[PDB]
Amino acid sequence: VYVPDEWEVAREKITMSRELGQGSFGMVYEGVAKGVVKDEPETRVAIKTVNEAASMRERIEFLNEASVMKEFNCHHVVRLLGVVSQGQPTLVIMELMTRGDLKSYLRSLRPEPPSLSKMIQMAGEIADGMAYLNANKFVHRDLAARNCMVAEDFTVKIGDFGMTRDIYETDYYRKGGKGLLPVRWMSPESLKDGVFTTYSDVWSFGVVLWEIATLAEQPYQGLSNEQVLRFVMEGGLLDKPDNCPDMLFELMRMCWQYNPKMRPSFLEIISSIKEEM
Numbered sequence: 354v355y356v357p358d359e360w361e362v363a364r365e366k367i368t369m370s371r372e373l374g375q376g377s378f379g380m381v382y383e384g385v386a387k388g389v390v391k392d393e394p395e396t397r398v399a400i401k402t403v404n405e406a407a408s409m410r411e412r413i414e415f416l417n418e419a420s421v422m423k424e425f426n427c428h429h430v431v432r433l434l435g436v437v438s439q440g441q442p443t444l445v446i447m448e449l450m451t452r453g454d455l456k457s458y459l460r461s462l463r464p465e466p467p468s469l470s471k472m473i474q475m476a477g478e479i480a481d482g483m484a485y486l487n488a489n490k491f492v493h494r495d496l497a498a499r500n501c502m503v504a505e506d507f508t509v510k511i512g513d514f515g516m517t518r519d520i521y522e523t524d525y526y527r528k529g530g531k532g533l534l535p536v537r538w539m540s541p542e543s544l545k546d547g548v549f550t551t552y553s554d555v556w557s558f559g560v561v562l563w564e565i566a567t568l569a570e571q572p573y574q575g576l577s578n579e580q581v582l583r584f585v586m587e588g589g590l591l592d593k594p595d596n597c598p599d600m601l602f603e604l605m606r607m608c609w610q611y612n613p614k615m616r617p618s619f620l621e622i623i624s625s626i627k628e629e630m
């Protein structure tokens with residue numbers, strides 16, 4: 354069960370354009386929306402949707418994951434703008450991040466070195482969103498560059514585009530043939546016991562920093578999914594990226610302490626980069 358509220362907006366006011374990709378519950382689109390932002394008759398939006406052919410309790414699961422965003426007010430987490438629970442298909446409308454996911458954005462820079470400054474900006478802008486989420490008692494459990502989102506001004510925001518895009522099929526393993534797992538981005542304790550925490554979010558952040566420093570290479574390129582498990586669970590780590598600044602590899606290491614209680618908080622990460630400006 355879900356009860357509509359003041360977030361509800363009318364299907365009429367929402368246009369869909371070109372598709373953005375396959376979501377957990379449906380296709381996702383680019384669009385425009387009216388009367389959803391103050392002094393702004395039109396607003397470009399991401400329209401997340403459901404397949405008419407999905408369960409009623411999956412249309413309920415879909416809405417109650419958007420109900421979590423109603424609580425948030427951080428400029429580094431992608432903004433919930435409205436809901437359309439009434440009728441078919443069921444929609445959520447969000448802030449449109451006009452440069453898409455951090456992984457495509459970094460990959461688009463290969464054939465052209467980004468400055469320590471810019472890499473440390475991006476790093477602080479990810480760590481701000483995550484600090485907020487961790488404090489509003491939210492564990493991302495799929496923090497990766499492909500789940501960060503980039504604004505027209507190049508500011509980075511935490512988002513989540515699910516585990517279902519064709520484009521990043523390499524980044525997921527159906528372990529034991531169960532559900533998809535982003536094994537390359539997972540803490541040793543997430544891999545062994547299925548323990549997701551703030552602290553395992555800090556591990557995924559270490560791998561995002563690696564992704565920024567490598568321009569989104571595949572972590573542990575040349576190991577199989579089962580070989581990644583073995584390597585990380587026995588205390589293995591990623592190598593210093595080529596041309597990696599000292600300050601940014603030391604962040605990485607901190608985030609990859611085997612003992613979760615040894616990794617720093619996002620709050621401590623922000624403090625740590627702040628004494629570097």
Ligand SMILES: CC1(C)C(=O)N(c2ccc(S(=O)(=O)C(F)(F)F)cc2)C(=O)N1Cc1ccnc2ccccc12
Pocket residue numbers: 373376381399400401421422425430431447448449450451452453454486491493502511512513514515
């Ligand atoms: C799938 C879609 C629409 C979505 O629902 N979320 C999302 C954002 C935040 C949360 S959240 O607040 O729970 C937390 F904590 F995870 F951050 C949960 C889900 C995206 O990021 N999305 C992708 C997306 C969004 C905006 N502009 C895009 C432009 C180009 C390509 C994709 C774009």
Ligand code: NI
Pocket residue numbers: 428429478481
């Ligand atoms: Ni900021």
Ligand SMILES: [Zn+2]
Pocket residue numbers: 410411414
């Ligand atoms: Zn379900």
